[PDB]
Amino acid sequence: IGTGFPFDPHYVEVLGERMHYVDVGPRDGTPVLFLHGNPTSSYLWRNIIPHVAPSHRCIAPDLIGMGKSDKPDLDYFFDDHVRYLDAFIEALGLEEVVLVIHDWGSALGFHWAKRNPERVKGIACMEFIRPIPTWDEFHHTEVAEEQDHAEAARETFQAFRTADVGRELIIDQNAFIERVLPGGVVRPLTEVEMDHYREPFLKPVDREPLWRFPNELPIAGEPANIVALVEAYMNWLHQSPVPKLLFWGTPGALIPPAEAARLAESLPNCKTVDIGPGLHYLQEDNPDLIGSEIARWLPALEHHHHHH
Ligand SMILES: [Cl-]
């Protein structure tokens, strides 16, 4: 699996700050917008984009306070991210797009789509965020062998959301980067890959977005604004005719194989793709199948639409 990041560095001004993004692919192509989550960057998509770029424009921003984007004095709430990515999209003059999304990138992407449904020609998603009404639903599974792992996951994120303790882990010990990220890849990440992921967060104080994110997860009614927002987009998604492509792995994390199977029915016009062994950061386990299946699925999205 490729460890390099060979893309031209692009930057654009957004709400006064700079945001870094990948922009490859023919300039005249329907754009495909790749949205990473916690605690990743555009690096997450490095081995997926080359499958899509021969035919389409590939745009992959680093969220504010992450990757090579600027680091304003914010608390990095989800709404902060909403503001910057909304302005990013308009700053590139994008009209209609295809979304490719993960984790908090999926919350952002789905929220954007629901508010801008006529501008989304398709959604490729994987290990995405859903309402979590109870902790038992978090990493829920009915596969006996996976139960111990699932309860460990609960404990982990309960701690992240525990006052002072959470900050200790994520801010002082860099747990999201040194433990959660490699912990959510089946194959071993290399030093080179880890170093790419560590680069934006060498200073602990810069780790704030990595702590706020788990504290923004819509679990057991809190935080209420996010619970509402996530319920809204999921209702939207369940009712939308927009073409969907869903990647999943075994045993998965947020999305277990059994639910992936259900989403194949509960989500209209949904093709599913088993990437084989996977945990949360599926992109690092089978980037080639994710990029090739996205590429195979993009042409038909032009149907019923036109550029002229
Ligand atoms: Cl998180």
Side-chain angles (χ1 to χ4, degrees), residues 38 104 157 176 213-214 217:
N38 196 25
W104 280 105
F157 277 81
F176 232 103
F213 266 140
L217 288 168

